Design an enzyme around this catalytic site. Structure first.
Site, mmCIF file in Angstrom:
data_model
loop_
_atom_site.group_PDB
_atom_site.id
_atom_site.type_symbol
_atom_site.label_atom_id
_atom_site.label_comp_id
_atom_site.label_asym_id
_atom_site.label_seq_id
_atom_site.Cartn_x
_atom_site.Cartn_y
_atom_site.Cartn_z
ATOM 1 N N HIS A 195 26.390 -1.707 40.325
ATOM 2 C CA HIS A 195 25.446 -1.499 41.417
ATOM 3 C C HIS A 195 25.687 -2.335 42.675
ATOM 4 C CE1 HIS A 195 22.077 0.442 43.102
ATOM 5 N NE2 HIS A 195 21.240 -0.578 43.034
ATOM 6 N N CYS A 257 25.443 3.997 45.239
ATOM 7 C CA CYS A 257 24.830 2.736 45.652
ATOM 8 C C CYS A 257 25.410 2.216 46.968
ATOM 9 C CB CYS A 257 24.973 1.682 44.548
ATOM 10 S SG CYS A 257 26.603 1.626 43.755
#
Ligand SMILES: [K+]
Ligand SMILES: [K+]
EC number: 3.4.22.-
Length: 312
Positions: A195, A257
């Site tokens: 992420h 992301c």
């Protein structure tokens, strides 16, 4: 009327005239378009950009001009893989990281015919599930804010160093403060495994405010605490002052992301006189009301606008 394309520097209007002709024309106009974008001269450069801007969604166009571009991309794909082209490596546009080569490589789904193309550009660069690398993200996010002196973006880092368990966000902050201080808006891009997090430090009149933008599943209290520990270095009093905005947007945007980090910084750059927390939360909420196709289009367009900074 297209005779003006060869008369001096090409107007922005004359380019719209070209794509108006392509929109209403057949194979000749497509072949003419490809020929013009293949040029080394200033005209070739202008056509190549205008075409890439339409290919990337940076410029809006009719749904009819999108179908012409898909054909132009296929024509360029065939030119890039042609044996004559391969023998003439001095043709820079066809042997270097160009917008033209990127569009060419986006024409099929056969990786067998994208290998050489990919190598010349740098592997599937056109996958919609690519987890962005730091350098690719660094190039795009910093090029994005060249015309925004109040908005500063830093090199993408990991939160915790693997072989020493040290907070890197704590060190990057310290170094930025010592090297240049914190700008009006300071963006930090932090990796926590798969992420990318957007860590925005912004001042509200002598008061430092922090903000974490998470576009995936919610965070562990462990990682949240490591962030806050780093956040306190920038002058954040207690852990309650750190605002975690967490909304999963990556269902139809796999590994997006970094895509949301890029688009977010763009939103902040164009809405300078506003509240970051509102700007971002409104985006995330509005993004969930979009259709699967509108999201998949965001995925594609943002990825193409991002990789443009990794091209000449
Ligand atoms: K800047
Ligand atoms: K600064």
């Amino acid at each position: 009327g297209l005779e003006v394309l060869f008369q001096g520097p090409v107007s922005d209007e004359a380019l719209t005239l070209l794509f108006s002709a392509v929109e209403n024309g057949d194979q000749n106009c497509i072949d003419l378009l490809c020929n013009l974008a293949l040029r080394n001269d200033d005209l070739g450069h202008r056509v190549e950009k205008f075409l890439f801007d339409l290919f990337s969604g940076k410029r809006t166009g009719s749904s009819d001009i999108d179908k012409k571009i898909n054909q132009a991309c296929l024509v360029l794909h065939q030119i890039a893989n042609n044996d004559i082209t391969k023998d003439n490596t001095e043709w820079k546009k066809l042997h270097a990281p160009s917008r033209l080569l990127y569009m060419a490589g986006s024409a099929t789904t056969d990786l067998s015919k994208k290998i050489g193309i990919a190598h010349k550009i740098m592997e599937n660069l056109w996958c919609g599930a690519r987890m962005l690398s730091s350098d690719e993200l660094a190039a795009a996010t910093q090029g994005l804010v060249q015309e925004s002196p109040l908005l500063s973006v830093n090199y993408p880092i990991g939160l915790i160093h693997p072989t020493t368990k040290e907070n890197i966000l704590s060190t990057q902050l310290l170094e930025k403060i010592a090297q240049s201080g914190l700008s009006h808006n300071e963006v930090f891009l932090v990796n926590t495994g798969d992420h990318w997090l957007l860590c925005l430090f912004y001042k509200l009149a002598e008061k430092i405010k922090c903000l974490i933008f998470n576009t995936y599943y919610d965070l562990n209290e462990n990682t949240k605490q490591e962030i806050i520990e780093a956040a306190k270095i920038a002058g954040i009093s207690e852990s309650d002052e750190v605002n975690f905005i967490e909304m999963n947007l990556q269902n139809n945007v796999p590994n997006g992301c970094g895509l949301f980090c890029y688009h977010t910084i763009q939103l902040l750059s164009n809405a300078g006189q506003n509240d970051p927390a509102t700007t971002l939360r409104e985006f995330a909420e509005n993004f969930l009301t979009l259709s699967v196709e509108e999201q998949a289009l965001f995925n594609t367009q943002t990825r193409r606008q991002i990789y443009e900074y990794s091209l000449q």
